[PDB]
Amino acid sequence: KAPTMPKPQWHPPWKLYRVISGHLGWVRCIAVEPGNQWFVTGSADRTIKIWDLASGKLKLSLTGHISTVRGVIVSTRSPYLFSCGEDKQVKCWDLEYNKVIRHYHGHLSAVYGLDLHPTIDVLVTCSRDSTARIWDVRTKASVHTLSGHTNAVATVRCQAAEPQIITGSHDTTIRLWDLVAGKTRVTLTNHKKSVRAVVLHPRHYTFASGSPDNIKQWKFPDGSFIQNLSGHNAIINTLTVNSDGVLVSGADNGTMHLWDWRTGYNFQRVHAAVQPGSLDSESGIFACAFDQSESRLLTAEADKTIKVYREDDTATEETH
């Protein structure tokens, strides 16, 4: 009798298969390389380390940050990785020599996240003071300063032609600017809670966003409220979706709620366990990213442990 109840995606539930906890501090950023060989992750110890996707062992570690590293991104057009954090410095750690190759600067305060364009050789970095920065690779020059928010910019997403520049702000308002002109193009009609989760879609347009209260969806052409999410009243930090139609939102209370892209029904909505050295209520999913094969999920918790979740070969898991 409910609307769109009989048109849900029969997706298999996810289950953890391996536990890896080697960092010293709460992990904030975790990414995967484009070649599906290793996975780069940072923590509060100011030392970014890479771990293999299959074996899970630590390949190599590298430090150099003065504060906590809250951002990590790997480039596909170039053979280098990019890192940023609370040390007010955006370091482009290359993979050919495992050293700092750019050491770009210019932000007035700490940096929240960083991401590169799908086709252009530029990178957009969200700072904390009053704005975000668009830094050009191999030039170390400020291309354009997009100051359209009244607070810190928590998340920022880019695309080749999807939404060009898309920066989520912590001032309970979203803004999508144009990379050519630099000014703000259109602002959102949602998110009374501070929105800190933006992610690209893995199919066509009309992608969604993520916030702590009343998470809704958007549209690529000029924005349009498509649908709202489920009852996830917890403070969400990162949302990751694969090309298969599954969407997962990581909260700061440890409970990870999985949803669908065609319908939006809660699939698992499972809670993550704590580590042996962790407290009773201390685990919080602050970073989540799927693998290149879109079969094994990897989530980064605040309990200093990187958990790898795989699929489950079951059939009696129909959604009511």
Partner: peptide, 19 residues
């Protein structure tokens, strides 16, 4: 597919060239 899928490759390439 008209309002749910992503844009075409030609318009995305033209927008990438303009950017």
């Amino acid at each position: 597919d008209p309002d749910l899928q992503r844009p075409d490759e030609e318009a995305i390439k033209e927008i990438t060239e303009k950017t």
